[PDB]
Amino acid sequence: DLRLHLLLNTSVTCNDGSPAGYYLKESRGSRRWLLFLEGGWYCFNRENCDSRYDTMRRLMSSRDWPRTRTGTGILSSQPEENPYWWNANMVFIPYCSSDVWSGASSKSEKNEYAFMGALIIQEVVRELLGRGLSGAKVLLLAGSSAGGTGVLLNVDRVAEQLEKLGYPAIQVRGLADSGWFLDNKQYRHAPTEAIRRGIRYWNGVVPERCRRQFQGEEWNCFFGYKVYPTLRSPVFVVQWLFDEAQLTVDNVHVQEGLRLYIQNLGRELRHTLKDVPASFAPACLSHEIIIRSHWTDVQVKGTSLPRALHCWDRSLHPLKGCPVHLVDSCPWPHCNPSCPTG
Ligand SMILES: COCC(=O)Nc1nc(-c2ccccc2)cs1
Ligand SMILES: *[C@@H]1O[C@H](CO)[C@@H](O)[C@H](O)[C@H]1NC(C)=O
């Protein structure tokens, strides 16, 4: 179990003004720290945020949060569930800002909700330094789905924060799981407009180099293949080639037209990853993996995800039989036999 801590700075809040927080399990014999960003869609105006507050309130408030949480997958402390980082300090950061971890706006007389995702992170890091993060060797910022995109938007800001605060020895890295989306044409007739509206609603912030490239066009930086080239911190990318959330936004739920559509989607995703040296992309129909209990099962070219992440660690000290770039080439869902049956 990871135990809950509400933020001492109560001005950093969830959507409804309740305090944000984090769950922590601390491993005093380790100098590695894993900070995981929860996912769960987003909302982009008053009307659909109001709907989210009725039936998805734990994603908008801490008032009902439980006191402990079980670490699963990469957050597990058992070596046989987590071959990669079982002895690390574990942190789970709940997603209660509905802004893809990008907001920096408080609740006011003109704002019904607060969107503080970028600041919630910003602050979890601050309070953790007093609980042992000051002695870390590596800080891995991880996340799934909306949290995976949140890794891409925030990893360089965390690195900059620790540099100005006087901790140049902490190596900040990122692990983005199922947050590598394409702004492609739908199968039937959209995401990009929802993101554009969201940024204005949230006062959303994007990384500085990406902002300077696109200059009204900041929505571009929410898409993996466009923002990744601008990042300095090392980032490992985990992405199913046929992600279920990507197919949902494409209005896909088999004859020739749809066959070509699905094959072209895999090809395009595969193309966007070819210059990404640390990546794991199996040809499966699924969504999220790294905090799933059976995340050790899937393999690409005979290498599991826990092994590929270990090989990544070694590379940051090509390696013989310990690869870090693993992308399937076969063109149809579940042509990899190790894909989840679920
Ligand atoms: C660039 O976008 C950032 C992002 O996080 N987008 C997401 N989209 C979803 C989603 C949307 C519709 C149906 C199922 C899932 C989850 S997260
Ligand atoms: C609390 O957080 C807010 C928003 O991030 C910030 O303006 C303020 O300086 C913080 N207070 C303290 C005491 O750090």
In the annotation, is 99 catalytic?
no
Q: Distance (Å, rounded) from C-alpha 167 to C-alpha 165?
A: 6
Burial of 132 (0-12, 13-18, 19+ CB in 10 A): middle
Burial of 105 (0-12, 13-18, 19+ CB in 10 A): buried
For residue 280, list its beta bridge partners. Answer: 238, 326
- Tell me if 144 CB under 6 Å of ligand 1: no
Marked catalytic residue, from 61, 97, 156, 287: 287
Closest by CA position to 56, among listed 41, 46, 36: 41
In the annotation, is 243 catalytic?
yes
Q: Under a CB-based contact definition with an 8 Å cutoff, are residues 304 and 296 in contact?
A: yes
In the structure encoding, which two tokens stand for residue 17, read together? 């003004």
Q: Is the Cα dihedral 262, 226, 122, 278 positive or negative?
A: positive
What was the structure determination method? X-ray
Q: Under a CB-based contact definition with an 8 Å cutoff, are residues 144 and 288 in contact?
A: yes
- Tell me if 145 CB under 6 Å of ligand 1: yes
The number of the ligand nearest the C-alpha atom of 7 reads 2
Q: Distance (Å, rounded) from C-alpha 82 to C-alpha 96?
A: 27
The number of the ligand nearest the C-alpha atom of 287 reads 1
Q: In this structure, which residue's CA is closest to atom 7 in ligand 2? A: 11
Closest by CA position to 283, among listed 303, 299, 297: 299
Q: Distance (Å, rounded) from C-alpha 328 to C-alpha 224?
A: 19
In the annotation, is 145 catalytic?
yes
Which value in Å is the resolution of this experimental model?
1.7
Report in angstroms the alpha-carbon separations of 50 from 16, 98, 100, 154, 246.
11, 12, 17, 27, 25
The label of the residue with tokens 């693993």 reads 326
Domain ranges of the chain: 1-342
